[PDB]
Structures are given as structure tokens and as C-alpha cells.
Write a protein that binds this ligand. Sequence first.
Ligand SMILES: [Fe+3]
Ligand SMILES: [Fe+3]
Ligand SMILES: [Fe+3]
Ligand SMILES: [Fe+3]
Ligand SMILES: [Fe+3]
Ligand SMILES: [Fe+3]
Ligand SMILES: [Fe+3]
Ligand SMILES: [Fe+3]
Ligand SMILES: [Fe+3]
Ligand SMILES: [Fe+3]
Ligand SMILES: [Fe+3]
Ligand SMILES: [Fe+3]
Lengths: 171, 171, 171, 171
Amino acid sequence: MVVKRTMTKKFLEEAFAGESMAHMRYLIFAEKAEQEGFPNIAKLFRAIAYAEFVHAKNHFIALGKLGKTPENLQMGIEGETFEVEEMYPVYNKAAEFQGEKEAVRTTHYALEAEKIHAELYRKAKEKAEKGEDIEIKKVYICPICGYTAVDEAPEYCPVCGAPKEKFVVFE
Amino acid sequence: MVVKRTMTKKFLEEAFAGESMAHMRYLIFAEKAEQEGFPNIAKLFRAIAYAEFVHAKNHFIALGKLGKTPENLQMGIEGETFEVEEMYPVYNKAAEFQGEKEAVRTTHYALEAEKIHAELYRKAKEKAEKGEDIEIKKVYICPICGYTAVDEAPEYCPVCGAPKEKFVVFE
Amino acid sequence: MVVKRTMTKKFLEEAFAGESMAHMRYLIFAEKAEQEGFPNIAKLFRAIAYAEFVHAKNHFIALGKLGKTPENLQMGIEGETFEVEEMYPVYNKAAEFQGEKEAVRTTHYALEAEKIHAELYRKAKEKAEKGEDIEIKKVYICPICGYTAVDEAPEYCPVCGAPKEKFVVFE
Amino acid sequence: MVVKRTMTKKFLEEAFAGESMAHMRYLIFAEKAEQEGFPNIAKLFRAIAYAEFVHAKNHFIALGKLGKTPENLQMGIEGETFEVEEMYPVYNKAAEFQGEKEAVRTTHYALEAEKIHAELYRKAKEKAEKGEDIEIKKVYICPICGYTAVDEAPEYCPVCGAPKEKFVVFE
Ligand SMILES: [Fe+3]
Ligand SMILES: [Fe+3]
Ligand SMILES: [Fe+3]
Ligand SMILES: [Fe+3]
Ligand SMILES: [Fe+3]
Ligand SMILES: [Fe+3]
Ligand SMILES: [Fe+3]
Ligand SMILES: [Fe+3]
Ligand SMILES: [Fe+3]
Ligand SMILES: [Fe+3]
Ligand SMILES: [Fe+3]
Ligand SMILES: [Fe+3]
């Protein structure tokens, strides 16, 4: 049965947040580990990150927020809408007011590339409540300021201007 | 340059936490999606999860929390120490007090498998500050209890009791 | 006095082997009897097994093979080393070539669970030659594959996956 | 199913004999270990003896020799008859011919105490082919010659002459 008590629900939510942060940290660590002269430490980081993923997935299953995909896409849609509409403009304005180049640059890379996720998820949801799988192939992603390019791939990234060969393909 | 003003630091930390949460949720949704009649939805889910990972990595680099591998391993060591000493025992006792099965089960799985991660990180670190890479191969992770097996893999899982065929190989 | 003539020594060794086999058979028969509606036949079997043990001990001592604890531990070390290094691998290979699943299973359990006994005996000998006893409590033995667990007990059996409750405890 | 191939059967029989002998050897060693300033090595000895008992039981069942209670009692009857009628008289005669006092003493103690088991087993088998149990209680065993005394125990040992309080009781 789903967890109903408030205090333990808060405890499990905080544990899930910590596990997600740890998994992100390990995934980031592995990239620099393989950039140096240690190709095995990256393997260790990847394995431990997968262990953290398993922990966080168990915590997510316990709280009971995961179900059928047609209703599951709505949470992603709402999260993307919140990230693009409200949270990011305020952070960009605050970073402009305080005057940090790095924060402004990162927020600018963020809000301009997060716009397509909501549209893609809405299309996927309205095409996937009848029992059929959507027709999509070769989703491309920029490795610096990831811009979800669908099917075809632009020669240069409109946001950062990276060359096409750097795109990480998914198939 | 690292962010020094307090408000921008808080905002970027919150953004990093949100992006990590988004990545983990998208990964879980992808794993559920591939388990049913829609194969191509998981591709989109994993692509957008990679995009969230890129955003989180940019936010993490913005706060300048990344250094060389010797110092990188210290953060993991401290995180594992805190996860296995302070948080999980208290959460398990609270879940026992309130009397719910799922939280106790998940915390029981979690607290019995995080003791080896600190030892692995310490072993990697002592070999990393000298200039060489450790030797490791065939790392197994249980997909129903997160249990790190080094090199040899037991026939049955000493935590959940799953056969050695169910494990996942990270080579 | 100890027996020195050859044929007397051969006869005593054969008698020792016969008494040991009879004691094992009576123990197995008693264990089977307890699993039925005859609880007193098990008592008779246990008493007669103890009598066979007394006869076997007399035969063994008459050969002059009982010494202080160091030499007994050394003899156990040699026996365990021979059991794990030479006999069981060849027996398992021959059984697998012939094609009987029960023989392969039994020999697999025997050569997987007999590896610690030698290390325990050598540690005990190292701690029991100066003049002191070895600190150890609450040993665990599996009832379906003979798995030794010292002090702590794993949640599950790494060899057969038998639950924790089924472990027999010696203290 | 039963093992039918010849060489696998031979290897299983040899392993059964070896495990039984090792179990008896460690049972013998435990009593001397606890009779010294090392009262905890007996715990290890008994735990390893139980593990070898499990291994020997596995080998015994692999051969398919365990059956219902009447068949087990018949096997015990045959074994005891062979042990008393043919083996021990010849062993005693050979020991007397060669001239060893210890072997003669041991065989003398054995052949004058093993004569009471066959009738006990015959009575138990006669009373066990009727769903009912035999009616015995408080079996006494001598510690230095294995004298099986049923119910009432003599004040002294008719074979060696040890007092009654040295007997071990099973009830
Ligand atoms: Fe963790
Ligand atoms: Fe997004
Ligand atoms: Fe770009
Ligand atoms: Fe996002
Ligand atoms: Fe961890
Ligand atoms: Fe497991
Ligand atoms: Fe007997
Ligand atoms: Fe006998
Ligand atoms: Fe052994
Ligand atoms: Fe087992
Ligand atoms: Fe053995
Ligand atoms: Fe006696």
C-alpha cells in the first residue's frame, strides 16, 4: 500500500532527493574521471551511480507516484511547464541583477532549450492514449546546452553554434 | 569564476536539485515505458533525461564544485559516510515507529548495501593520488536492492535472494 | 600402548571407518524419524549413535592419533585442504561429464561452502598456540548446503538462497 | 532420482565415507578442546561437524538410500548383525594373535556391548509397521565402553565397572 503518514512521506521524499543528487554527482564525476588517465574509475562511478538509481527508484515506487504512461506523461508536462514559465525567468532576472556572467549564461542556455520538451510530451500523450506507439527516430541532442533536435539534425546549434558532429545521437 | 553572492548560490543549488529530480523521474518513466507496448516513447524519455543531465552538469560546473579526481573522491566518501551513518538508521527507526511496510523495506535494502561504497572510494583514492589507475572488471549490480558486487558475483543475492542471472554487468 | 603391527593397524582403521559410517547413518535415520509420527524411535537412534561414537572414539584413541589442540588443528587443516583442493573439483568434473544433476549439485555445494573451514582452523591455531582462546560467538550453519557464517549471519544464503530463519545457530 | 552410473556412484560413496570420518574426527576433537583452557574452539569444531554432517547427508540422499522407517530399521539390523557376528570376533582373534593389549581391550569392550542393539531394532521394527511408536524412555549410555541400557540402569557397569553417575541419559 502507498505511504500515508506525513512525516515518513517527508522522510522518503528527502531521501529520494538525496539519492537523485548523489546519482547526478557520480555521473558528473565519471566524465572527468574518464577525461584523465583513469578509465576504470569511470566504470566504478557508473556502477555506483546505477546503484543510487536503484535506491531512488525503490523510494519512488514506495511513495506510489509511478503508474500508467498516459497519466505518467502529465507529471513531466507539468514539470517542464513550471521550469520554462516561472522558475527560470526569475533566476535569470536575479542573476542579471546581482551580476554573475556564469549564472546568466547558464540560465540563458537553460530557458532557450527547455521549450520543446512540453510540446513533445503533449504530442506523445495525445498520440498515446489509444494503444499505439508514436513514430519517432534519431533524436539528437547538443552536448553543451542540450537542444532536443528531432529526426533531422541542424548543421550548427542555433543556441551555441556547436558543429553537427558533436551531437549525441539516440536510437 | 565560482558564484560568491549568496542568493545566486541558493538559486543555482535549487536548480541543480530540480534538474536531478527531473532526470531521475524521466529515467524511471522510460523504464516503465519500455516495459509495455510502446518502445519508442522510452527513446524520447531517455533523450530528454540526457538533456536534463546536461542542464544539471552545467549548473554544477557553474558553482565550481568540480576538481581533480583525488579531491573528487572525497565528496563521494563524505556523502556515503553521511548516508550510511546518520540518515538511513534514523529514517528506518521512524518508519518502524509509524508502522508501514514499504518504507521499512526500502530503508532496510538501502542501509545494508551502502557500507561497501565508502571502502571502494577510499581504495580508489589511495591509488589515485599517486598517479595510477586501479584494476577492476565485471562489476555486478543487483536490479532489486542495489548491491555492489566486485569481480566475483555470488550465486544468490545475500540481501533479496535473487539469482546471479538477474544481475547487470558493468565492464 | 599404541598399536604398531601392520594388520592390527589396518583392522583398527577399517573398524573406525565402519563406526563412523554407522554413526552417520543412525543420525540420518533419527532425523528422518523425527519428520514422522514416531518420536521415540529417534531417541533410540540417537542413543545408539552415541554408543557408536564411543566405540569410534575408542578405536581412534587406540591408534594414538589424539594429541593436543595444535596438532589436532593441523590435522583438520590438512584434511580440509585436501578436501577443497583435490577431491571435489575432480568429483564435480566427473559427475558433470557423466551427466547427473544431483551429483553436480551436491559437489558444487561441497566445493563452494568448504572454503572457509581451513581459514577458520588456521586462525584458531594461530590464536591457540601461545596459550589463549579465540574470541568467537554465535556461529551459523545452513541446513541445505552447509554454509558457515561466523559471528554475523547474512540475510540470505549466497549459495542456495535459503532464508535467514533456517540457519542453525551454535553458541 | 537414484544415481545409476558406476563411477559417479563410487565417487559419491567415497565422499560419503570421507565426510562421515571428518565429522567423527571433529566430534572427537571438540571434547578434548573443551577439556582444556580453550572452551570456545569446541564451538568451531561442533559447527564444522554439523556442516560436514549436512554434506554427508546430501551425498547420502543423492544415492537414494533413505527410505521409510521399517526399511531404515531393517538396514540397521543388517549392519548390526554383520558388525557383531563376523567382524569383531575375527578382529579380536587377530589382535590376540599379534599381541596388542589396546586392540584386544577395545574389541572386548565392543563385542560385549554391541550385542543388545539387534533385538532393540527388531522390536522397534515389529512395533513400527503399525503406525505406532515403540515405548522406551531414559536410555543410559556408558561413557567408556558404550553399554546400551534400556529404562532401568544398573548401579555399576557389568562390562567395565564405572559407577552409574558417569552414564549419559537420553530422554
Ligand atoms: Fe545513497
Ligand atoms: Fe526539460
Ligand atoms: Fe548547443
Ligand atoms: Fe528540464
Ligand atoms: Fe551511495
Ligand atoms: Fe538483491
Ligand atoms: Fe549401531
Ligand atoms: Fe555398532
Ligand atoms: Fe569439510
Ligand atoms: Fe544454503
Ligand atoms: Fe568435508
Ligand atoms: Fe562401561
